[PDB]
Amino acid sequence: NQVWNIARKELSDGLRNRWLLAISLLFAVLAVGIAWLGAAASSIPATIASLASLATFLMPLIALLLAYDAIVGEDEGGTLMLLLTYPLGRGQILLGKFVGHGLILALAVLIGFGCAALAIALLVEGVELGMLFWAFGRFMISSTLLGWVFLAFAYVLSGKVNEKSSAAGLALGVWFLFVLVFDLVLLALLVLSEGKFNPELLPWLLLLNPTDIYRLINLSGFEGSGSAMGVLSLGADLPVPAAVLWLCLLAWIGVSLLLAYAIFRRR
């Protein structure tokens, strides 16, 4: 198949990016460092909300470092106009780039949360290995999905722009908006209205930010304190179950990938 033949390039091109391997080793040495500081103090709901906050800062960052120059980095490099004269479609060199860059994020978080599990089962003596494997299995198959959202965000903002210096400006803008601006606009909307703007709409505004849907999935079982949640304390007011929250994360991929394909189809 042609989708795997072009995925094998990006799998062998993203792993030679030295800027990736810096901040993918930074994700590994911080997930050990959070789990080691979480092991000497014990607690359990603080090491989940801090690991999910660590992957809130880095799994969008590795995704946007990979794929900001996926389409426009090939267009001004000349190798995109050549590739369309190969037996391919425009739908195969995007889905192929998504599979190729998607296996990097599936490996960049299997390194990170894999060594985080070995920094708990070899550190916390007498920990429940069944509860550890289940909780970090939910961390693995949902931080990829957060990574695949921002991977599909980067294909949207690469096909729309036509210069790579401006693609890095939009990829930095998307990383600032979804991670630490939407969490602060929602905070400032709640403080300045003193929680009396809307008592039913404001928990549904968490679904317009995939980093907040990501934090709500991993903080399902281990709620604990409210100050560890902060603005995520609105998630107790959401009447939606947990299974739809997986589906609302997958719908953030498929909407932002079909938008990435509809922009690329009229490139």
Binding site: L190, V191, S193, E194, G195, K196, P199, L202, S225, G226, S227, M229, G230, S233, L234, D237
Partner: peptide, 12 residues
């Protein structure tokens, strides 16, 4: 903030 309209705040 105070969502549920009691006298208490919502976050610690």
């Amino acid at each position: 903030w105070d969502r549920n309209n009691d006298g208490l705040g919502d976050i610690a």
